[model samples]
Target: EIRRGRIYRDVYHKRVDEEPVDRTADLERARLGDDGLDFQDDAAQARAFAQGVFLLEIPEWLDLSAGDRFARQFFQGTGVEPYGKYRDLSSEHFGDELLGYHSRVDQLEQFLLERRFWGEVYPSEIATLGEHLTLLSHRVLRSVLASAGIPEEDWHRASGGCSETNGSYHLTFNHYRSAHQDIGLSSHKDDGFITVLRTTAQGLEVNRDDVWEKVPVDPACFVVNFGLSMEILTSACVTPLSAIMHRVSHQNFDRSSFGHFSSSRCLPGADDGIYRYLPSAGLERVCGSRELIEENAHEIYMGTEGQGLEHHHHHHH
Candidate 1:
């Protein structure tokens, strides 16, 4: 708990690390008066994850060509390495080896912002899905905000409000082909308003009710989960929900996934006149853009800072 703001270096707590595992088990063990080193019971974690985590299936009519095109394009773009020289916004600490591209999606087929020593390639599929997912995200945000007591007209302002900071885009990539019980993407929560995901194989799991359970992969569906911004927007009281703790489980086959982050606007002035509801807690304070919540994320987070949606520049003062 004391190490919240610090980058999590699993090596500090273990020996012979093929990779560092989540320390939830260690922390729990320490609290239990044990050596605080054993892997905690995954069963309980799975139960907890299931309690708050829910799933949404993509509408059957939605074009999956974009998802499929991106998958094939991912290979042509990155090749058989399972990864490449890619730095995340958290380059000061941990960075991603996964090879993929981030496209803003509203313009120029949402060209790649960074492609790591390679020629730029735009897959219509990626842009297609980015726009599609953005629409879906707005609908969901509106419903949830309404339940949280925000009015319909204001829903538009609350859902995105900031086109300049509309960071909704697709992050499609492949993980190593070798299987390991360790991990691919470590345990963490999403920072944006919501994350829409589609995986080509098994791997993603969630920690809830003290047990970790696999989030199923279906060709006909995409998975959507709430993010930190959504939680704070409702003052952590809208639904009985919180941001889900998820990770990519070990896999032998190369896995492909598209993480579309509908980041809440964090740009300055994005929060003007916004006020959110807080269940019985009511509106004690005016609601700020998701960016405001994110501004403080680094100060009290365990996974990738800024919910992994912020750009390196946005992370700066």
Candidate 2:
């Protein structure tokens, strides 16, 4: 049996049989009440993070064949055995990893077109088909942002200039091919405005209160979740519908997903009201939007990923 090793502490092993929560209607949680997030109130922002979660369907243009093709390409190119297990694509355990958070497929095209990885760009058909698949989701994301009452002028700014219409996107795969209880991903939240994902398995789970529930496989829909910036910007007034925490359950099933992040950059004065809310004793003055992400990433990930590990892991970037 695969033991709950030090690194697996945050990875839970049990599964629930209850019907999964339908967060489709919870998308407007941010715009509702005093419980909404306020930047100055870190406690409120934390609450918003815990509370925001939802789901929607976009099967019209989300072609499973195209998505599967790319998944196989990434796995084959990286030489990752189909049945092998992986902690994460970015970790060193996976050699010759593919990495980036781009705003368009063309940008990705160039990097791939330039033979930046392994001395060969992927095939032309692959790149063309790749752009088609992700851009469809991107369009869905932009429409959602607009419907949420975010002003047109601030839409681009709020999404860190990567709104779906502007082509914010990514093309990738995950390598957690297994059926055991080995943990694929530990508990963690995204560092963007919202994240749109497509998956091939049911190992995904979300936290409700403190109990974990499985996110059953819904091939015709995409899972969407809001993040810290969304909660803070809305001042908790507008947040995701259900308070949620997400991770791939430790079922060890083969899974692949594309997470297109609607991330916003924290402009100094614009977000100062929230930072000012943090108590000064354990804090220092900050001046940029990027810093907010770094700080949040450090606090959430560094603090947890290193917990119970053989060696202490601290990430400042």
Candidate 3:
């Protein structure tokens, strides 16, 4: 079963913020454990996460309104176009109907400030929020590893250090403008360690017991889900957690969402038989190599064989 609850504001702020400023008193007050959430305990959070997905309430300090404004400026800006090196933007269509549009920013520091895609001016708040979300994901992963009793050194080796500089991290902005009924996104598992998603609509669904169930949309909450990298990295020491398959269906209304996708770094050394016993050793091989990993992961993730969707053929571009 999926767990839904709020993380303590003090705990969240402490983890995500670099400096507490004047919030030390607030942190002390919140640390008294008056919060009503069950996963306040780190071990409990890990147990809940093993179920594949969890709903976490966004802390009050996060500037969600600013985030919404940034997304608006991003999707509707005249300078918005697909990046050349990576097909970062997807403005897809089916027959005569427009499907959806999405753009990814992999290098937050460079892209956020230097990119001309935002035209002459970029929303500065987006850069701050993106960095914060990335840090939050690392904190979440650390909590999971610590709770599972996995040694810190093992995590460091497997993850190759989880941060914006070392790890593979990206922020994806999705704008669904389709007025016609269709599956906005096909059912598939994410390729990262964890995805932190906040959406403005109710069309997103998760596969549970082979049935698709709508993920409740709460503006106050950010939906967190495990991904293939998390499953692979934690396989040996932690209890196995499957990467949840999820999708978005078109409700004939415009929708938007932004997600922070966090993945482990691709280390230099080849596999040294440490992870040879894993069930998905073939996948581990793909994970170990930097060159073939992206292509192979794309094939498995966006391919037409198992996942039920044909609109993603353009992903190859």
Candidate 4:
């Protein structure tokens, strides 16, 4: 039986890595405990990431069970009266449920995304459902932020995220696929300050020297990556720790496989202001377009200008 609550750990802590004690004031070291917070620690995560090419699994929690079987109910139908009334919670084709997913010019069809831990489905199906969803989300976000040392006063869900914003706060499990040479996904970044992700099943890896090292999913811990927009504002502006850029590979696992899902909070900013993209060292010359390849090597992140949405680049001062 699963316990009431258990704090998950970082993958690096559970591994064979040398101690990063070179810099006593290493930001990532201080931010992520001794555990390597992320594989990449010197850039921003605010760039665009296409969700169409990889598999994502959210977490599933319940009252009494050790085995994880939230996939069926997660993708299909919940069969829980109110939830099942509007859309068949049992149906897997939620593409129709998205209604306005890629509803903009700058936005394109990225992936078959799935929702995190179910709190409320915004519809007439359940009365006063939105309130409950917000309440639960608030509690979860605050807890996560506080634990991450992001300061309670610095967290916000509205007008907070750079991508997929509009006072809409629904995040999903993005999936990617490929049939030929698995160019399943491009190396890109995100726009949130903090992203908490739990892995389920198989077929997931991080970009490491043109090849992906299988960092298989385990319910035991969650995968955390920084966002590009956040990089623009924080240590990149003050210190020198750069954010990491990442992506997923093709579906080598069973295509029919369904996985669990969920997402955490991001550090929020002030209201009534223009949200802008911040650049890094040579970001304009190397990956300015956002989508990065092996030809482009990572650079020294000195915050600068001329940023792109789908690529990274490097240029002079």
What TM-score do all the candidates reach, one by one?
Answer: 0.57, 0.54, 0.63, 0.39
lDDT accuracy of residue 146 in candidate 1: 46
lDDT accuracy of residue 175 in candidate 4: 30
Computed on alpha carbons, the lDDT of every model, listed in order, comes to 0.45, 0.43, 0.49, 0.29
- Name the best candidate (by lDDT): 3
- Please report how far candidate 3 places residue 253 from its true position, in Å: 0.8
Residue 9 of model 3: what lDDT?
A: 20
Give the Cα RMSD of candidate 4.
Answer: 14.6
Off by over 4 Å in 4: 1-168, 175-181, 207-212, 255-317
> Residue 215 lDDT in model 1?
66
Off by over 4 Å in 1: 1-52, 75-121, 160-181, 236-240, 266-276, 279-317
lDDT tens digits by residue: candidate 1, 54-120: 4455565577665554553443334332222231222222132212343211111111221221223
Model 4: per-residue Cα lDDT at residue 194: 35
Model 2, position 78, has a per-residue lDDT of: 41
Models, CA RMSD each: 13.2, 11.9, 13.6, 14.6
Model 1 CA lDDT for position 48: 26
Per-residue C-alpha lDDT of model 2 across residues 225-303, encoded as one tens digit per residue? 7654554444322433331456664444455565555444333234321211122232223223445455544433333
Residue 62 accuracy (lDDT) in model 1: 73
